[PDB]
Amino acid sequence: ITGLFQGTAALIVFGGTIAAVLISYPMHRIRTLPAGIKLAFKPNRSEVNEWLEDIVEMSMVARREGVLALEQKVLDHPNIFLREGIQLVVDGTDQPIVRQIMELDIDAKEQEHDNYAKLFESAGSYAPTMGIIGTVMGLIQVLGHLTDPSQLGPSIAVAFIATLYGVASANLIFLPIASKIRAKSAEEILVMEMILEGVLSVQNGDNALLVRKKLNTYIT
Amino acid sequence: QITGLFQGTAALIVFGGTIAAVLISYPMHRIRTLPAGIKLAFKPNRSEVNEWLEDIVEMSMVARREGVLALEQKVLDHPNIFLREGIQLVVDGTDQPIVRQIMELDIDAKEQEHDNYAKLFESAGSYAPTMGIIGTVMGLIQVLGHLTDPSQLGPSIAVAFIATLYGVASANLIFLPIASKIRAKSAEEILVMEMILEGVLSVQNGDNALLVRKKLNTYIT
Amino acid sequence: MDIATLIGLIAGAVAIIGGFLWEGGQITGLFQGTAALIVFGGTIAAVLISYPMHRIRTLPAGIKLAFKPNRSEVNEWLEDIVEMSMVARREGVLALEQKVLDHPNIFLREGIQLVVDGTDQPIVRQIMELDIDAKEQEHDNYAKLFESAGSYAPTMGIIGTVMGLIQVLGHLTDPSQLGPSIAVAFIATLYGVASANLIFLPIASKIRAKSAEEILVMEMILEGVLSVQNGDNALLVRKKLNTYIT
Amino acid sequence: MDIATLIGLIAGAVAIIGGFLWEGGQITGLFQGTAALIVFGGTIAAVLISYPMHRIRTLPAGIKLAFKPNRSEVNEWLEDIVEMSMVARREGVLALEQKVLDHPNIFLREGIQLVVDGTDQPIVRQIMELDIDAKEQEHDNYAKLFESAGSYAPTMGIIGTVMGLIQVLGHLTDPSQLGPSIAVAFIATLYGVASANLIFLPIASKIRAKSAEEILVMEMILEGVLSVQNGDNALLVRKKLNTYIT
Amino acid sequence: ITGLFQGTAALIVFGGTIAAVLISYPMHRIRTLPAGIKLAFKPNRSEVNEWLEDIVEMSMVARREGVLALEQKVLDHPNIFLREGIQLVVDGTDQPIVRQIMELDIDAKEQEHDNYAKLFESAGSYAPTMGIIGTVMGLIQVLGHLTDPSQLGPSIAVAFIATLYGVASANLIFLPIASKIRAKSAEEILVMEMILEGVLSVQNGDNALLVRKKLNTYIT
Amino acid sequence: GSPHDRWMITYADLITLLLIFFVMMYAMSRLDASKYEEVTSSLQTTFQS
Amino acid sequence: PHDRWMITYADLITLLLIFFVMMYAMSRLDASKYEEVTSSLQTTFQS
């Protein structure tokens, strides 16, 4: 394995990838890249089932205690999106406007996660082509002095290892990470749409059976 | 002909690497669904839709004469759960855009489930060919490094190219072909569900029987 | 068959084979059984897996749509629909039925009966557009088989050239068996690229191009049926429907 | 011709030929019979198979759109569309007829004529948007011929290459002097790549660029004839329509 | 590196790329490339956080003092799109019409930035293929000297340099610039969409807390 | 074509490098016509001129 | 569609390879040349 590290091949492939990504994005994107990885690799604490019972409780309250009672139930609730959603309904705002206020938070969260994945997907697009550049700079050197000058072997290496770094990094690191970010955005966005459908159903004062039947569509 | 075309160290790089790339690429709860995915891919149709229509059609006639109170004869629980529940939303306490909304969420959920099955096979079928190249380049680095005689250079390189042949062939004969069949059966199952949504809403609108068969047969090949 | 396909295949043969025969080739030199088995057998396999059998059995209808000879009938049905609108402005709706009771266009016949039966205008479009989008989906389901075949075959080519290199590279020190072996690395490329780009992908494009023309005639008849229900005046009916014709 | 295409083709020829001469070479060695016949013959065959003959007969009009010099006087028609609104405001809609007896733009004429005849706003939008959709579809159908010519020509290059090698190696019978014979076989890849990327795909791009530039002027005229029906004030009319001008 | 530089391989790739964009677009588009780059490398001094305070202040002034007091404040504001927006609402124009007139301007700005990026996306699509052309014209010449393996090696080595310029320019210059134009376009369209919810909320007369809630969804 | 074909950039790389090797090895070795003759007739029968 | 080039390049290179292999096939490699590259290669491979 000691023979798989090659200085010039790492500088061409990774230095090239870094250069292409730094040209491609504003600096305020790149400064957020840590949060991309921290989204990808956090454990599934998903508690959709726990919230589902809270919304059902609030529906049963809303039918009986009146809309003004809901505030006491959400007063210190841990889910901020649910808190804001319920509070807009206790404040008596109309259905097409509470829909419009809530959907903007979901759209912002969907855009924020896509902005993370695209930086990773782009790195996975450039690094393979830096492979080809590393290979061809290598071939130009090898064929340049083909007089068995004894330097052919060293340069043949760079031409191989630049391929290996370019392909392995793309298909084992950058592009695999990208898939997880996109797959885990689709957990959180779905849970937000469930909470929205919860808040609207509480405002319409649907019965517990209709509430549980609708919300179950977002769970598996 | 089969002449020395099996090499272990080449299957281990390709399939081991593919599994590694897929396990990084998805949360664990996705991977545990692959048994269902492959069963949807290779599972008999035994389509009965030509029968579900007949039932949906007949129910309309009952509502037109017998009130919706007697539309509960579906409480026999037709095998299709979607129809049982759908008609239990046409039983009173409901209104047409709400009945549409609750039914259509089940369809949108089932479309998203089947796409999430197929995406694993599409991604597996993209990673496998690229690993083949890794297996080949790893082989060449080992050979060229320790070259003895010019005589054996030919045979050695050949046993090294097998990684590529395993990779590209696996992708275009197993992974990517299945991915297609999962998605092709999903678009046939969703189509039946959309037809029933046609049935359930029409009955509630109390449309004439003859029009019912014209709307429903539109979905039938 | 169809005139543009007939000219195309004749030009194709004179170009590819007729060029090679000028420079003194032989037709039997372009046949290699192992290369045909790898490329066409591999392609057929990937297709039979990737689609249900009830789709594979539809391919005759796909070809019959692609090479259907062209018809100018749209120019006739425009006059029929305008005449029916002329009747609707002036006469009892019974005439719209009995004027149509023998008509060859089934979609138009059914559509007119829906308005004479007095069904509501936003309900009529909800059954007519259902009948259209079923026809649109049928033609897409034909074309996807050829788009898939033309996607697999190139790669089976690369599963031929590499299975050709693995033979040649195995007999470097034997120039007596290199000759028949090296042929596979060429010919398996050639079948992979030629089948994709002269058969499968061209057929796929032509199915889709004929489908668009079928759907446009249906969309015109829909605007016909709805304008007869509105009782729109004949010159404006002519003006709307003429946008679907060239 | 369009000035950018004239500068472009001069640059294209000077770059390709100037490069080929500077590294040593003579032009008479870069022209080959069989390679041209396979690459262009095969491209023509693939396109003729891919489309009905009624499409292929429109190909001249594709070029006439692509290299049309940009006269378009949208800045002049804006003053007409604003002025016509003032005529409706001061003298009522019936005075509009006299302003548009003879206007060069038929789409404007038809639009205004529907408004003075007092058609409903959702109807005048519907009848006019059909014309824009028909123009957009017509120009897309021109471009796909050039896009598909551009996707076949490179692959015909490979087929012409491989058939070249097959003949040379086949009847090799040569004194280790194969360098010239092998070399010529690569001319087919040069014609396949050059024609795709200096003719077919560039022409396709320019068709689509000029289509969008024309559809914008139609969408402006639509907001022009809708606005005179609602009776907007002159400042708001001049504000709205300017958003369609660069 | 005096052996990595070339005359003819640069002329075939860059001259061929220029010939392919000049044929591929109208002349009036090609003269806009300076403005494309000027957007791509616009130094970030953005002040969305300042305009949000201005809009919130304007709302509560409208809700207290009556709409006509808005006229005084808008006159001096530097953002031209915001100025026109309030001027519509001071003119008392109907809400579905204010949305229509404002959204035409946003659509026009989105289309202008797409038209800037497409020149670089197409330049980076042609340049690799001009590399292949430059390569193949090399090989056609060289394979004539196959007899002597004395010069075949050195000759081929220089022939592949056209591939190197075609791939390096595409993946380190043209496609990265195209990505950055699109990235900085979206972060200007977002500011306009925020101004739109600003202007409409001033017209509806919603209270300051709700305005500050809605607008912040467009900010990071 | 969709991203499934993204492996092509890499495949190209493999062959390109392999090409470097064989061309590299060819140059060093002159050809023995006898081998050249047998192949010319080994291929002649196969493509059938 | 920005990847058109690779699908043609591939073929071009490939065609060269298969030819060159055959070329080398009917040629004989002087051991001296092979050794300098093979011995130079192994040690430089970091062996």
Numbering used by the authors:
A (entry chain B), E (entry chain C): 27 to 246
B (entry chain A): 26 to 246
C (entry chain E), D (entry chain D): 1 to 246
F (entry chain G): 12 to 60
G (entry chain F): 14 to 60
Give verbatim excerpts from the published study on this entry.
Two of the three structures (Classes 1 and 3) were found to have structural properties typical for other stator complexes. The Class 3 structure showed a high similarity to that of Class 1, with an RMSD of 0.53 Å. In contrast to Class 2, neither a large cleft nor significant deformation was observed within the MotA1 ring. Despite high structural similarities to Class 1, three of the α1 TM helices of MotA1 (chains A, B, and C) were not observed. Based on the results from Class 2, it was expected that LMNG binding would cause significant distortions in the ring array of subunits, which would hinder visualization of the α1 TM helices. However, the structure of Class 3 suggests that the interaction between the α1 TM helix of a MotA1 subunit and the α2 TM helix of the neighboring subunit is not essential for ring formation, which would occur in a state of equilibrium between association and dissociation. In the structures of Classes 1 and 3, the two plug helices of the two MotB1 subunits (chains F and G) were clearly visible and were located at the periplasmic surface between two neighboring MotA1 subunits (between chains A and B and between chains F and G). Furthermore, the plug helix bound to opposing sides of the MotA1 ring, by crossing the linker to their connecting TM helices.
